[PDB]
Design a protein around this ligand. Structure first.
Ligand SMILES: [Cl-]
Ligand SMILES: [Cl-]
Ligand SMILES: [Cl-]
Ligand SMILES: [Cl-]
Ligand SMILES: [Fe+3]
Ligand SMILES: [Fe+3]
Ligand SMILES: [Fe+3]
Ligand SMILES: [Fe+3]
Ligand SMILES: [Fe+3]
Ligand SMILES: [Fe+3]
Ligand SMILES: [Fe+3]
Ligand SMILES: [Fe+3]
Ligand SMILES: [Fe+3]
Lengths: 178, 178, 178, 178
């Protein structure tokens, strides 16, 4: 039995380019987390309490995704390398602009997973594609959700009254098309 | 005991013009179904989640009506003839315009039933008028409901804020005058 | 943030050939639905009440699959295009012949999904392959089930007594090997 | 306030031809009852216990229908005239032949109601057509049921094994397509 790079028994070696890609993706998840924390704060500063609660929960979710990836590297007997984390964006001129950045962040998180996925397929790493499959499925739902929130905010067309109604929807947990 | 056109024992023969009219009406119910599916999609594309859920349920209801009619033909020992189904309308410039088409569809579904009803009376087919009576009663309630939804949307006068409020009413199941 | 063809925020563009393939597959699901409705009617006309109830439920299931696909296109910000629906086959000389057509319909539904799947892989659309994966899994179970029902009916070898026994199995919900 | 023919206060006079038709129809219901009693006995004599129980219940149901009509005449302040009741048919060469007579009896019961209905319409007696409407609706279901039982017995094609299976269905209360 061979020992993997993190010292555990090694079921199958991993290509170092794929390992690097996964470690980089963990940073993307962590960056999504702190971005949604920053967005939660921006909403709280403007008394948009429902948006604040929504993004507070999304920040915790993205962090859980990052940890989920660290556990996969442990399971593959690969080293983790937790990286320096950039400061998030923190300023937006409107809720519509913030929601566009949020949608972009969600789509970019998926693109990162897709990049890892393609590298795994190039290396015939079926453990990794199987690991990522349900995460891509979750991303489809999150992209649908963030498209819904962005589209509903854009529909409001900057009217504070409509934004208050949507804010109350989010406080109630009405965050998807259903 | 005589055998009817579908091969079952025949309680009473049916005029072929009435049979044709019922088969055509089943197509109307099926077309109402796919129309409401198309409307559900149009609303979902615009984040009108309550309208989407409402029309999704109406599509399933209209399909159940179609099946209910197929069961009546079975009960009368008459042949069913499931027909080619036209594509629905799929594009509207506004929710008010979509709701006008929906009301029209509901009224036209009733007109079709009325046409079958008159033909049954001309043929003294009291089984068929009795079968249709509760369906007309249901249509009165559906016309009242669709007049309510259309009128409430028109009252909004294209204001997104008001349309969001109504959308949330529909998500909550508040779809009638009560 | 770019807007997709249906107007929603676009997470990732979709190849138009893949979009066309998905829209066509939705028609296949809808056609499976109306085919099973026709089969339910054929069984009801011959007092095969258990087969009638089984196919009535399968018709509703296939319709739900079609809607599930329309929701995926909404989620991908792609246009839906609900198509004209052919009339189903409606005449069979025996239950064994009907069950052969049903098995074929189920296998052909899978082949359609496989065709979409291959096109998605050619376009590196991992959202779509992930979306389809559980549907293929469900198809394996449905093919196994329909092979079971067809094989059990063929075993009966046209004996009405055996077909009545199987009919009662289906009425009871005993529709699979277990 | 005028007194009707049975001595009660009279809400609206009834045409004597319509009264005679209703009194005659009550005899039809009573004759259906004793016919199903005779059929129950024929089945019991051949150990067809499920058919015996089914027809025993149908005999009681038809009697309840007769009483329901006597109550309507009381409500209309009209005289009842309970008539001599013919002996039922009591001999059949096969269960299939008995079931054909049963279906005929059910259809003939509906034809009698239809005859009363047409006479009421000729006399603009809307109380009577309203009274009969739900009874015709029930007749549609009973005709569908008796077509189902007859068709299932004919499918058995005289095989005792199949007839025993159907007999057990009826004992269990499985008497309709569902
Ligand atoms: Cl805004
Ligand atoms: Cl509008
Ligand atoms: Cl067969
Ligand atoms: Cl027989
Ligand atoms: Fe994530
Ligand atoms: Fe995310
Ligand atoms: Fe309808
Ligand atoms: Fe309708
Ligand atoms: Fe009525
Ligand atoms: Fe399907
Ligand atoms: Fe299927
Ligand atoms: Fe009766
Ligand atoms: Fe009866």
């Amino acid at each position: 039995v061979a020992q993997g790079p993190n010292g555990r028994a090694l079921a199958e070696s991993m290509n170092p380019d794929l390992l690097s890609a996964i470690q980089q993706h963990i940073s993307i998840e962590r960056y999504a987390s702190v971005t949604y924390l920053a967005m939660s704060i921006w909403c709280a500063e403007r008394e948009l309490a429902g948006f604040y609660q929504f993004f507070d929960g999304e920040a915790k979710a993205e962090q859980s995704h990052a940890v989920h990836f660290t556990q996969y590297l442990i399971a593959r007997s690969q080293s983790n390398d937790l990286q320096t984390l950039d400061a998030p964006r923190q300023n937006w001129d409107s809720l519509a602009s913030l929601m566009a950045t949020a949608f972009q962040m969600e789509a970019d998180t998926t693109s990162s997973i897709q990049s890892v996925y393609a590298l795994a397929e190039r290396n015939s790493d079926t453990r990794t594609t199987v690991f990522l499959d349900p995460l891509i499925e979750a991303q489809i739902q999150s992209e649908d959700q963030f498209a819904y929130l962005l589209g509903r905010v854009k529909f409001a067309n900057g009217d504070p009254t409509a934004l208050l109604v949507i804010d109350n929807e989010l406080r109630a947990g009405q965050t998807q098309r259903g």
